[PDB]
């Protein structure tokens, strides 16, 4: 009863039937990165199985290879998209600070527009990951600075209605 050959055969058959492939445009249109978490797990599903001695198929090995190469790039891209989405939600929820953060918004949108034409096979995909991180990094810092300053201005203007009626 303890033989696990059936489990390995079933898993290999399921993954082959899925026919997972990362090739395609790096983004698609909510913004998404065409790199699901599952493509990571298959690589690990090979990494342990090779230790267990099961002869994994060559195509599965190649898919694990592509997953391993593109996973850090996909994490950088999905982190950038998630940061942009949450920060955009924060900015939309507070319409007062929309004008100040206009430059970072148009910059990141322009970088995304440049990247729509890219593919996972593009050599320029890795330099774009470098480009997007810097611009998003600047956008986060300046937004953080304004929130500190804007609250102080909000408190100070709030002080005026209740402050003492003297010129000083």
């Amino acid at each position: 009863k303890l033989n696990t050959q059936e489990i390995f055969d079933d898993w290999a058959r399921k993954v082959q039937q899925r026919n997972l492939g990362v090739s395609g445009r790096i983004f698609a249109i909510k913004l998404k990165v065409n790199f699901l978490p599952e493509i990571i797990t298959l690589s690990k599903e090979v990494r342990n199985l090779k230790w267990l001695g099961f002869r994994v198929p060559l195509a599965i090995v190649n898919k694990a290879h592509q997953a391993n190469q593109l996973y850090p790039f996909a994490i950088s891209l999905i982190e950038s998209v998630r940061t942009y989405e949450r920060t955009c939600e924060k900015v939309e929820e507070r319409n007062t600070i929309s004008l100040l953060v206009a430059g970072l918004k148009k910059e990141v949108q322009a970088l995304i527009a440049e990247g729509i034409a890219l593919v996972w096979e593009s050599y320029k995909l890795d330099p774009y990951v470098q480009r997007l991180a810097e611009t998003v990094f600047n956008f986060q810092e300046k937004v953080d600075d304004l929130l500190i300053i804007e609250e102080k201005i909000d408190l100070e203007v709030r002080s005026l209605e209740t402050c003492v009626y003297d010129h000083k």
Partner: peptide, 21 residues
């Protein structure tokens, strides 16, 4: 007044882009 595109309007634009492709 430059304003960030709403999620819905930006995604309708992206829908228009994807559909035509």
């Amino acid at each position: 007044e430059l304003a960030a595109e709403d999620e819905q309007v930006f995604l309708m634009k992206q829908q228009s882009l994807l559909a035509k492709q």
